[PDB]
A and B are shown apart, each in its own frame.
Chain A
Amino acid sequence: RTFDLEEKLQTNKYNANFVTFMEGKDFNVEYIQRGGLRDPLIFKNSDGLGIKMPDPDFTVNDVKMCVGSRRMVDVMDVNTQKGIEMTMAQWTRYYETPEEEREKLYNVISLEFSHTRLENMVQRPSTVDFIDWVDNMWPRHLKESQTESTNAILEMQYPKVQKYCLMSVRGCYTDFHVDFGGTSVWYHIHQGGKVFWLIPPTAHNLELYENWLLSGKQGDIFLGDRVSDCQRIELKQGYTFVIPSGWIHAVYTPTDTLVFGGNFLHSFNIPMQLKIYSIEDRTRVPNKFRYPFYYEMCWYVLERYVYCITNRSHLTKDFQKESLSMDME
């Protein structure tokens, strides 16, 4: 890394205002229908969101006891933005090591904890449940069949991207990116705080973004300096953030922090979701960092729409019979 992170945290130059500050009672499906979820949103307060979080003093070791000491986890080497892997017990030990004793900066942003004890301790905002393609489009009996709590692709019965635990030590940086498949992101600061930089996905900015990835000077160019308008903004403890599809963002951690969030495709900015997928195609992103079963899910979205409106099914007889059985529960 060849740019000075501390000036990027100190400058006033990132003074765009893209974020709408909202009350939770107003974040509903009518709002989504009306606005296309195009705008980043901040809920300073969790009222009317329908969220559920763990005990306020929950710790990384608590997380590890719910997901298992031996669960393998993706960790990010901050310095290089490369990925490594260790067990949650090892991660927990790193995280409990004193600041001055930790040789390297490591971040976890990719612990998906569905089908573990932790999963029922966390609930997203309700409105997400009304629009997430996983819930509303994927054949239910497949989703329900999932037993594996890791992200082993071979055991995966649906796109396992709904509930993530992110655990970050003071000093963590995640460089500019767009979430996989153009997914939208909900993001809840349980303990600590985060600083975000936000760039809107105008055609131009997405062009710069892709060019920047293909150039590999990502440690050299702070992408926010390359664009007309960038907003830097702090999330405090108990805030909830929603990031629309395509939004290019980086994130710094000023204090040890615990965050629960997750990713979701929806029916209201499909064009963007496809744009982002195609950028991953072109820049050759490994499958593992992508949204599982992307096109498969898109096929099921089409089938649902035609079925819910016209009442003609394009599912197999067996799949139709599995859905009837669940309708009768």
Chain B
Amino acid sequence: QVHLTHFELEGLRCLVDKLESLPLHKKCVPTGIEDEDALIADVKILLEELASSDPKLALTGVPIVQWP
């Protein structure tokens, strides 16, 4: 129902494949993250669901990620 830019979608696919495939000693899972694996899984679903985002509707002029 929201529209990301392909820039982002492809970025976030790159990031998830990256982070997932680092070994334990290089993964750098930070203090605030609870379950990385559960995070990796949710990212992948999200990307499936957003794979069909419209390029023109993504140009909202405000970022998806903001503090409320």
- Point out residues on A near B: beta carbons under 8 Å: 28-30, 33-34, 36, 130-131, 136-137, 139-140, 267-271, 274, 293-296, 298-306, 308-310, 312, 314-316, 319, 326-327
Interface residues of B in 13-61 (CB under 8 A from A): 14-16, 18-19, 22, 26-36, 38-40, 42-43, 46, 50, 58-61
Structural contact, B46 and A305, CB atoms closer than 8 A: yes
Say yes or no: A305-B64 contact (C-beta < 8 A), given A267-B11, A271-B10, A271-B11. Answer: yes
Nearest CB of B to A143, in Å: 11
Structural contact, A299 and B30, CB atoms closer than 8 A: yes
Structural contact, A296 and B28, CB atoms closer than 8 A: yes
- Secondary structure at chain A's binding surface: helix, strand, loop or mixed? helix
Nearest CB of A to B34, in Å: 5
In whole angstroms, what is the CA distance A306 to B47 when docked? 10
Structural contact, B59 and A308, CB atoms closer than 8 A: no
Nearest CB of B to A160, in Å: 16
Residues in A with CB closer than 8 Å to B60 are 30, 33
- Point out residues on B near A: beta carbons under 8 Å: 2, 5, 7-8, 10-12, 14-16, 18-19, 22, 26-36, 38-40, 42-43, 46, 50, 58-68
In whole angstroms, what is the CA distance A29 to B5 when docked? 12
Which of B14, B43, B63 is in CB contact (< 8 Å) with A271?
A: B14
Structural contact, B61 and A29, CB atoms closer than 8 A: yes
In whole angstroms, what is the CA distance A268 to B18 when docked? 16
Say yes or no: A302-B15 contact (C-beta < 8 A), given A33-B61, A136-B67, A314-B42. Answer: yes
Chain A CB count within 10 A is highest, among B12, B33, B40, for B33
Structural contact, A316 and B61, CB atoms closer than 8 A: no
Structural contact, B32 and A316, CB atoms closer than 8 A: yes
Structural contact, B12 and A305, CB atoms closer than 8 A: yes
Sample 21 A-B pairs with CB under 8 A, ordered by A number.
A29-B62, A136-B63, A136-B65, A139-B32, A267-B63, A270-B8, A295-B26, A299-B19, A299-B29, A300-B32, A302-B12, A305-B12, A305-B43, A308-B64, A308-B66, A310-B42, A314-B33, A314-B34, A314-B39, A316-B31, A316-B34
Which of A33, A137, A312, A327 is in CB contact (< 8 Å) with B5?
A: A33
Least CB separation from A312: chain B residue: B42
Residues in B with CB closer than 8 Å to A305 are 12, 43, 46, 64-65
Structural contact, B63 and A319, CB atoms closer than 8 A: no
Residues in B with CB closer than 8 Å to A299 are 19, 28-30, 33, 36, 39
Which of B5, B58, B65 is in CB contact (< 8 Å) with A308?
A: B65
Structural contact, A316 and B65, CB atoms closer than 8 A: no
Say yes or no: A293-B12 contact (C-beta < 8 A), given A305-B64, A306-B43, A327-B68. Answer: no
In whole angstroms, what is the CA distance A29 to B7 when docked? 13
Nearest CB of A to B68, in Å: 6
Least CB separation from A139: chain B residue: B32
Residues in A with CB closer than 8 Å to B36 are 299, 314
Say yes or no: A267-B65 contact (C-beta < 8 A), given A296-B30, A302-B43. Answer: yes
Structural contact, B15 and A270, CB atoms closer than 8 A: yes
